[PDB]
Amino acid sequence: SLKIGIVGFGNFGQFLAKTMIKQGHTLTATSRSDYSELCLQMGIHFFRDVSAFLTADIDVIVLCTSILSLSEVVGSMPLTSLKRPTLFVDVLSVKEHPRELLLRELPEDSDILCTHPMFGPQTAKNGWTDHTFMYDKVRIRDEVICSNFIQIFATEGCKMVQMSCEEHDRAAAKSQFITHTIGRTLGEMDIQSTPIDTKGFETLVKLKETMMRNSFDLYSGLFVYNRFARQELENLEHALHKVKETLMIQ
Amino acid sequence: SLKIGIVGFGNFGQFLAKTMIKQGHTLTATSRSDYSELCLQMGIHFFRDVSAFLTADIDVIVLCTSILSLSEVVGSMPLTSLKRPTLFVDVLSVKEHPRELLLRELPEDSDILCTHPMFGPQTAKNGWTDHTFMYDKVRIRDEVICSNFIQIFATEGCKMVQMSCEEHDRAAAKSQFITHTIGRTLGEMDIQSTPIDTKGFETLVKLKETMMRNSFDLYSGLFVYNRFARQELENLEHALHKVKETLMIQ
Ligand SMILES: NC(=O)c1ccc[n+]([C@@H]2O[C@H](COP(=O)([O-])OP(=O)(O)OC[C@H]3O[C@@H](n4cnc5c(N)ncnc54)[C@H](OP(=O)(O)O)[C@@H]3O)[C@@H](O)[C@H]2O)c1
Ligand SMILES: NC(=O)c1ccc[n+]([C@@H]2O[C@H](COP(=O)([O-])OP(=O)(O)OC[C@H]3O[C@@H](n4cnc5c(N)ncnc54)[C@H](OP(=O)(O)O)[C@@H]3O)[C@@H](O)[C@H]2O)c1
């Protein structure tokens, strides 16, 4: 409890590491880019080469690369260099895609846990308490290891939500994707504070600031790999034109 | 300590009344609809017809009708029946229109103060403190009465902002109007809480519920009577379209 290897040590991978290190887990990391110095600072063992990574002593592998790159990343991995059957955890913001991919590409005897912490650096600055953690036990035999990993979030007092990947994607297309879409639209407008802001407008400016601090890759992945996203983008445009037209009538 | 009459005892009219009564001003009301029983519950005299209202003892008349109705309402007022020069105060959400209308329609010896408290029943439930109050001293000769009215909001800890009616409508088109438009758009979509709401999405549901509690009359008036509103609506529509365009080429 627990030796954890992180694939993709960018913004979100780092976020998770800080709390897992605090709880006492032993971390290993690997990534496309060089995080040697940062991992040195944090006492994480960093492997630049993913084949070297897969030979380390690891209970759990956490996939933390961008949605867009997950196919490339998993596809290149020498999964035949896996030393034991391992638990694979993804933390992608969309869920049907990693689920099908990992089911197709991973060795059969390896376990699959699909997850999405509904929070991050911009929204969980202090702690994780009363933030939501979604997960789906896609292929779990070793309940002990699975339970240990899931406990990482429970003991931070996350709200715990078990849900299918498809139901996560339907619900996320109608909520998170719309939320990001609005934040970006406001970012494209570059809204600015005024002397006479309303509470509502202050709220939108803060949403703009937060949504824009995510990568464009992340936002795109929400759309490209969520099959329910396109319809929500449509409903959003269709609703704005309904309001616009009632204004024209008036 | 003022004799204050409200014209238009609707939602916002009643909101202003509650605080002015508490401060110890003598308050009386008139309106298109009959608020006899509500005013009996609240302890103030209601005049059903404006003619009787105009011949009472009043230092300050506050106009709290809808933006759309202002011109009709002021036009139908037997303003010649006024006993004394009186302070007229506007609290409409747009400002160039009432400033122009009142300078045109009022007796010359009546004073004019144009205001927009940047808050209401839905956003200032407990107390006015730290909320913004904009005013423009359009035509003041009696600085004593006017300062005593303004002191109503200052006493409550409002952030006091003096600006021109034009600068107000420019900033308001960029902020308040935009905010209402997105709120109304989310309402047409009828977004709802999900088990995996992000903090950003909770923030939008709140905004939707809040914005949707305003009358469509009110929201119309923000657009129809603010000449800077149209370009802001284009900026929004144009921004959304660019965001969509970046997503579609992937
Ligand atoms: N609040 C959040 O940010 C949040 C919350 C929940 C879930 N997630 C999910 O966690 C994952 C990481 O999110 P993020 O915030 O760190 O930003 P991101 O832009 O979505 O992902 C950045 C990560 O992708 C890595 N990566 C590895 N191979 C890559 C390749 N060929 N192409 C592109 N990127 C590659 C990057 O590696 P290098 O750094 O080595 O270059 C980096 O580690 C995403 O799947 C995201 O959906 C994020
Ligand atoms: N948070 C807020 O709601 C807020 C904040 C700041 C400023 N304001 C401004 O305060 C004013 C009132 O706002 P509101 O929230 O009460 O809602 P509103 O829908 O903008 O206006 C309601 C008032 O307008 C009256 N009215 C509507 N049409 C009329 C007509 N043809 N003829 C005569 N009177 C008419 C109504 O009279 P009856 O009720 O008797 O029918 C009611 O008193 C507006 O100008 C608004 O821009 C509102």
UniProtKB/TrEMBL annotation, chains A, B:
GO MF entries: arogenate dehydrogenase (NADP+) activity; NAD+ binding; prephenate dehydrogenase (NAD+) activity; prephenate dehydrogenase (NADP+) activity
Keywords, comma-separated and alphabetical: Coiled coil, Nucleotide-binding, Oxidoreductase
Domain of life: Eukaryota
Coiled coil: 226-250
UniProt keyword Nucleotide-binding present: yes
Signal peptide as annotated in the record: none
Pfam families: PDH_N (PF02153), TYRAAT1_C (PF26213)
GO BP term, example: tyrosine biosynthetic process
Binding, NADP(+): 10-12, 31-33, 35, 65-66, 72, 93, 119, 215
Xref: Gene3D superfamilies: NAD(P)-binding Rossmann-like Domain
UniProt enzyme class: oxidoreductase
EC number: 1.3.1.13
Stretches assigned to the Prephenate/arogenate dehydrogenase domain: 2-250
Name of the protein in question: Prephenate dehydrogenase 1
Source organism of this protein record: Glycine max
